[PDB]
């Protein structure tokens, strides 16, 4: 069994900027979720090999996780807040698509997503 390569976190071909919204995404949004008691399954790519989930990457063709997001923020990968917000939504959506209501991982995702929603509701106006 094999995992795919992780999503990229560096690409000199990609355009990027450092903005007040992206700073908020790191300092407020990512930090809040990262510290949460239920963050840990989401802090790195799903290891479908060790977890014995051989169909994971058959169903999830756009993997995303907060370790990748953290690196993207820290390594100034993004052009705008929407690109980052999309990554968070992909991560949550992947969990809901793969799993079933009431599963522990879904409950965990839902807790993180509640906080995500509240933080992004106060994303500052661009400077
Ligand atoms: C340890 O990190 C994870 C991260 C995950 O997603 C971010 C998942 C995930 O999306 N599903 C599961 C997973 C694993 C098993 C063995 C489960 O029991 C029944 C088989 O379907 C369930 C319901 C979910 N484990 C993750 C572990
Ligand atoms: Na993943």
Swiss-Prot record:
Site feature (Acetylated histone binding) residues: 99
Residue stretches making up the Bromo domain: 17-123
Any coiled-coil regions, as ranges: none
Glycyl lysine isopeptide (Lys-Gly) (interchain with G-Cter in SUMO2) crosslink residues: 58
Tissue expression: Ubiquitously expressed.
Function: Chromatin reader protein that recognizes and binds acetylated histones and plays a key role in transmission of epigenetic memory across cell divisions and transcription regulation. Remains associated with acetylated chromatin throughout the entire cell cycle and provides epigenetic memory for postmitotic G1 gene transcription by preserving acetylated chromatin status and maintaining high-order chromatin structure. During interphase, plays a key role in regulating the transcription of signal-inducible genes by associating with the P-TEFb complex and recruiting it to promoters.
Subunit organization: Interacts with p53/TP53; the interaction is direct. Interacts (via CTD region) with CDK9 and CCNT1, acting as an associated component of P-TEFb complex. Interacts with RELA (when acetylated at 'Lys-310'). Interacts (via NET domain) with NSD3, CHD4, BICRA and ATAD5. The interaction with BICRA bridges BRD4 to the GBAF complex. Interacts (via NET domain) with JMJD6 (via JmjC and N-terminal domains); the interaction is stronger in presence of ssRNA and recruits JMJD6 on distal enhancers. Interacts with NSD3. Interacts with NIPBL.
Miscellaneous field: JQ1, a thieno-triazolo-1,4-diazepine derivative, and I-BET, a benzodiazepine derivative, have been tested on tumors with success. Treatment with GSK1210151A (I-BET151, a I-BET derivative) has strong effets on mixed lineage leukemia and promotes myeloid differentiation and leukemia stem-cell depletion.
Clinical condition linked: Cornelia de Lange syndrome 6: A form of Cornelia de Lange syndrome, a clinically heterogeneous developmental disorder associated with malformations affecting multiple systems. It is characterized by facial dysmorphisms, abnormal hands and feet, growth delay, cognitive retardation, hirsutism, gastroesophageal dysfunction and cardiac, ophthalmologic and genitourinary anomalies. CDLS6 inheritance is autosomal dominant. A chromosomal aberration involving BRD4 is found in a rare, aggressive, and lethal carcinoma arising in midline organs of young people. Translocation t(15;19)(q14;p13) with NUTM1 which produces a BRD4-NUTM1 fusion protein.
Protein name: Bromodomain-containing protein 4
Organism from which the protein derives: Homo sapiens
Organism placement in taxonomy: Eukaryota, Metazoa, Chordata, Craniata, Vertebrata
Full protein: residues contained: 44 to 168 of 1362
């Amino acid at each position: 069994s094999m995992n795919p390569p992780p999503p990229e976190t560096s690409n000199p071909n990609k355009p990027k900027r450092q903005t007040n919204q992206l700073q908020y995404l790191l300092r407020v949004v990512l930090k809040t979720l990262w510290k949460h008691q239920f963050a840990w399954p989401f802090q790195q790519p799903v290891d479908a090999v060790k977890l014995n989930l051989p169909d994971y990457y058959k169903i999830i063709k756009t993997p995303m996780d907060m370790g990748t997001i953290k690196k993207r923020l820290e390594n100034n990968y993004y052009w705008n807040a929407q690109e980052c917000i999309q990554d968070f939504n992909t991560m949550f959506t992947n969990c809901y698509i793969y799993n079933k209501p009431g599963d522990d991982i879904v409950l965990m995702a839902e807790a993180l997503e509640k906080l995500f929603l509240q933080k992004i509701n106060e994303l500052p106006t661009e400077e």
